[PDB]
Symmetry: C4
Subunit: 296 residues, 4 copies
């Protein structure tokens, strides 16, 4: 069941592809749940806490190094800074190698890489950004800072991966995943269509000014969504009536309707997916247990 | 059942009048739903994808009116003998042809259906909106030839209305189709009710505030109404004017307005839309199924 | 129908429509078949148009009053002369009509109070519209009193009356099931959720504003009113977080502002939204029944008006 | 009621009310018929009146304290010969007296109950909050006499804490009591989870941005953190600086932060609050009843 050395039920269920109809519900059987919970507390609950603390420390060291950066390449302060930079690069390459090892070991069907285990892809992409930032730094360029800030943001965001192992916060993270995947996606598609259409209309209306550029008008229109719109950002054009009509149409369509609809849909989805989000967290904790077990 | 060429069950159900009690729920019968799904997957899916692809492409031939629109004034304009002006003119011709085609499609629908003149404005909003877009394009053309400067506004309206109309092509996918159906229900019911009440409240408080002040740039009704509306979008000032008297009265009026609209009616709208979401799931799925059925039957009749 | 419609002593429909709020389940009384069918019949026969006629005349009155108010002269030291012009004639006759309407509303309110004879304990949840209209009428009358007393406070009173008149159009939402239900939802929410949230939020606002103004030393924002307004301005999504800099202990100022923001904007407003959602999910049936009872009260009052 | 209300050694009321949180069903106990009839009898009999008097005197004390602190003049300060200065001094003396009184009441509670060092941070939030308010007041007094300006900061902290703590007296009013209990539950669960996630995201993106920014006003971590936080209150700027080498990266980072936090996390917080409110009605009523029982027992035991 758990230690077969030929084929284990735990390995089959946990490492199953998304195709399996009930890869979550079948971990709730009495013996499996009892064994998983007992193992976690026994010798995987404090192995995970140590990993989480080490990652936190690594990220602190990475932030300190990057935040204090001086045509690269470029006292006690400098020795500490270079040591931190080297340690951060050494962590990035470690994550890259772990991701490649996971890619080879699991060898996905070239379909579940895009639908399953988003954590592995995110971590590998963070490592890839860090390595690109290193090569640019050693290749006489300044885009090494853009790559590094991208990697830093992604790494800080990735700390949610460790929210698993704490029940309530694990459920919260699973809910975040579901919401982003379904509701934010639908809303963003519709809202981007609306925003682009109205921004193009307004740009066509505008005759001459600083806001002829499609980017400028799109930014100004998006400014409404964040409660910072202007509604008078420009007055260099004819037919003010048409401009105000278009602006009011956009406001009513996007701010007064789509965002409130997003709130309502989020409420409904949260009301719907409590038990599924509990089962998904349980399975995410089972995969963590088995990965920790196999890492030796 | 499906095609007797005289009066088939699917044809009558799909073209049902609004007065029919449960026009939406008829398709749920197993043979009918299984027959629509099979026919779609068999030959209508690719046709619909092609139509959406060519439609969005056709609209995009004119969404670059920014780069197109000259600024010389008093059209018509001249031809520059450059590749750029060749692209501009061919795009304009392609945008006018599209408008004429959509106008005639609407006319062909209107005549063939021969509506009883009541369900026209109650159901089938998509084709009315497409016809309005065609009308706005034709008006742009006629104004353009007539040496007038209102063609820019007329094409801008058409452009915006077409970009929003892509929401029609949103159908054909269960998730986004049902999302569009929910948007339709919400904008018809909750937005209309809230808009009526909020517009009454805003007009009242705007007239009160305008009467309060004495003179300045905000003396007009329109300007003060705009300032009061700016509270709703999260940009309210609370001190937009100084040339007045009775600061107590002005402040208390602004507070009453804010508390009554921003902190009450918007949250009421959120709650009502939430309960509507909770209530119109299966209804919104059935309506999407009926929309797909109408599209399939129209494609069949398109030969 | 004998002993149901009208007896000159007591009829069940009149009793139900005018029943005191203290009755346990006065709302469900209308649910029985004969009452529902008969009220629908009377409305569709006569009161449907009569109510629309009471919503057409009132709208005309309010438009006339607003037109008179907006075009008012600004010269000071009232009253003012009646110059020879069509505009002056029209505005003065509009003023006369508006004052007459105010007097009419004043008299109707007095008559209702004298006939119903309320206990002065049920004039908040009951006869809400009556109190609103009477207060509007009172504001108009005091406006006139100031006007002919040679005081400029008539402008303030008249603008208050105008605001109440325009916002009282919701009374006429009855006669349309969806609009009437929405209006009664507004009234219930105002009665419960707005009043609870406002009390808590006001306590928080006053506390933090007093703390901040105590911290400040001198300047424009040294007063309690200006600081209270600045703190309130966060709630409408236009906070500053840096509105003042003439003080000491920037850390304390930042801590207080962040604490206030987290406690109010992030917690209490989203809590109000959640409670409103729950209530709305809970108040459909009673909101329908209350609308039906309000409908019946309108029917009975129109019938008794003869 | 023999050995239920008064026993001098142990009774059902004093055992249930003062039961540790380790007790499984501590809340549901008071719903038993005779207990519910006895608590409501004692309350109506006298505890309502004593509680109302205590609330009124506390409100008077807080008004005095606010007035004294508002008109504050290297302390200490002398006594100017004027009525205003005498009233200020007597008011601040009264405020200090109230502070020491609350301090000693908190000490008495600690000595009496003798909690197990774990219920302190999970039970009795009100008493610890009152004690912290008193501690701030005493620290303010000692600093004031020690010739420092830090007394102003201490006293403003105490004043704000007291004003927000005034909610303690909302109990004894059913609706406001349930409201306060629900506020307590929301702060413990939803605000905590959201704050954890939001702080993680905010620090990550703020660090990224401040790393991108070359130099200027916002080259410090605190300033950039403040600017990013401003987006949460509907006051983000999106153009607050231009001192960077890559505009595309800056705009992408800001858009990602906005989408992740403002659009997503805030709306999700609203939804989670709605779910919780739907979930915790009966549990919020039971907790209010238990709070009302504790208050009744305390008032009885105070004499
Ligand atoms: C690829 C890119 C897609 C990005 C979308 C965001 C992904 C997301 O939903 O998160 C999930 C979480 C990890 O879930 P898991 O992988 O473990 O769960 C899996 C697992 O296979 C489980 O077994 C399945 O059953 C379960 O269905 C499945 O889901 O990933 C985080 O750790 C939060 C990350 C939160 C941040 C979101 C990304 C932000 C990008 C940063 C951009 C910075 C740029 C500057
Ligand atoms: C004032 C603006 C009013 C806009 C309301 C438009 C309606 C809407 O809400 O959309 C839905 C969709 C139409 O569905 P359908 O016609 O197919 O549904 C019908 C049909 O009978 C179906 O068979 C039935 O089952 C179904 O019940 C029945 O109802 O309309 C679109 O085609 C999306 C286009 C969305 C555009 C909406 C207007 C936006 C304003 C643009 C402003 C630009 C101006 C510059
Ligand atoms: C310790 C610090 C933790 C602060 C978190 C906020 C605490 C909170 O949830 O509130 C609860 C309320 C008092 O509940 P109670 O103690 O009586 O209930 C408890 C318990 O909860 C449960 O019910 C039963 O065990 C039984 O009922 C009883 O044992 O406390 C207030 O009075 C509102 C205070 C609201 C303000 C929140 C604190 C704000 C701090 C001010 C900062 C100012 C700085 C400048
Ligand atoms: C000194 C007064 C300060 C307040 C500013 C004056 C104007 C405030 C607007 C009036 C407040 C009530 C608005 C409201 O929300 O109720 C709407 C009414 O239709 C109630 O409906 P109905 O008459 O009972 O049918
Ligand atoms: Na704002």
């Amino acid at each position: 069941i758990d230690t077969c050395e030929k084929n284990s039920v735990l390995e089959v269920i946990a490492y199953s592809s998304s195709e399996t109809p009930n890869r979550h519900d079948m971990l709730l059987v009495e013996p499996l749940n009892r064994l998983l919970q007992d193992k976690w507390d026994r010798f995987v609950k404090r192995i995970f806490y140590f990993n989480f603390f080490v990652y936190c420390l690594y990220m602190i060291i990475f932030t300190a190094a990057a935040y204090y950066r001086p045509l690269p390449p470029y006292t006690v302060g400098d020795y500490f800074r270079v040591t931190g930079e080297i340690l951060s690069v050494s962590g990035g390459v470690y994550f890259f190698f772990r991701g490649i090892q996971y890619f080879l070991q699991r060898r996905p069907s070239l379909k579940s890489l895009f639908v399953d285990s988003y954590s592995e892809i995110l971590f590998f992409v963070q490592s890839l950004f860090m390595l690109v930032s290193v090569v640019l730094y050693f290749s006489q360029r300044k885009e090494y800072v853009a790559s590094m800030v991208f990697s830093l943001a992604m790494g800080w965001t990735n700390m949610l991966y460790y929210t698993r192992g704490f029940q309530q916060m694990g459920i919260y993270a699973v809910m975040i995943e579901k919401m982003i995947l379904r509701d934010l996606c639908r809303f963003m598609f519709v809202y981007l269509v609306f925003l682009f259409g109205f921004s193009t209309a307004v740009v066509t209306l505008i005759e001459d000014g600083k806001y002829n550029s499609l980017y400028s008008t799109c930014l100004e229109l998006f400014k409404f969504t964040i409660g910072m719109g202007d509604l008078e950002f420009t007055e260099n054009y004819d037919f003010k009536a048409v401009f105000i009509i278009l602006l009011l149409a956009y406001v009513i369509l996007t701010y007064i309707l789509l965002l409130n609809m997003l709130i309502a849909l989020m409420g409904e989805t949260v009301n719907k997916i409590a038990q599924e989000s509990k089962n998904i967290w349980k399975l995410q904790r089972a995969i963590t247990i088995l990965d920790t077990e196999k890492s030796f």
